[PDB]
Symmetry: none
Subunit: 123 residues, 2 copies
């Protein structure tokens, strides 16, 4: 893209993913789409899969103009884990830690992200 406000917004989101979310201990199973060779029934159970690589690909294509659409996809990782792995699964706890570091970092960056969202919107 050529709009610096959008590029900057996407860059901030990408670093939330790589610096914070992917740093959660044992988070690797959420870094990429579920591998059907190891989890053979995953895509028969989960209608709308989501993972951090897919989110990063969306960021690289500037598909998030607001934090809410980005957070919606992050939240879907957890919701899918509740459904597939179970509400109390070790994997679900890890997914919630991923969500928590994302949500809390977005809160940290609130003033800066608000400014970018309004400058992406005006254009």
């Amino acid at each position: 893209s050529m709009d610096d406000d959008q590029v900057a917004f996407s860059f901030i989101l990408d670093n939330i993913v790589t610096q914070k979310m992917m740093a959660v201990p044992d988070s690797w199973p959420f870094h990429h789409p579920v591998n059907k060779k190891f989890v053979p029934d995953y895509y028969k159970v989960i209608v709308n899969p989501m993972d951090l690589e897919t989110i990063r690909k969306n960021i690289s294509k500037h598909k998030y103009q607001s934090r809410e659409s980005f957070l919606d996809d992050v939240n879907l990782i957890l919701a899918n884990s509740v459904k597939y792995n179970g509400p109390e699964s070790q994997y679900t706890k890890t997914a919630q830690e991923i969500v928590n570091v994302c949500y809390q970092t977005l809160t940290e960056y609130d003033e800066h992200l608000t400014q970018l969202e309004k400058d992406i919107c005006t254009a």
Copy 2:
């Protein structure tokens, strides 16, 4: 109760529910047990219902001595929504905002809550 550490702990939890969780936009359907008159099959699907009023009643009776038991009931609200509404439902997104703001507020009060939990345990 007559134990000030327990009363203070419950008071803090109660304000997380009323000041943050119940302030989530459009969260009213989670404020009370699901009304079977509008959702007639709810209690045939959901074996362990949970809602914010029930959690507040538990808090008033000092049933939570630690964040973990409190979070177990908070997360159950989300688990029930994933099962009944689905991982991508608007209602599940609302439940996730409730859960996410709860974790974020607990982190903000972490030093205060850790001290109270450790003083409740000694007795």
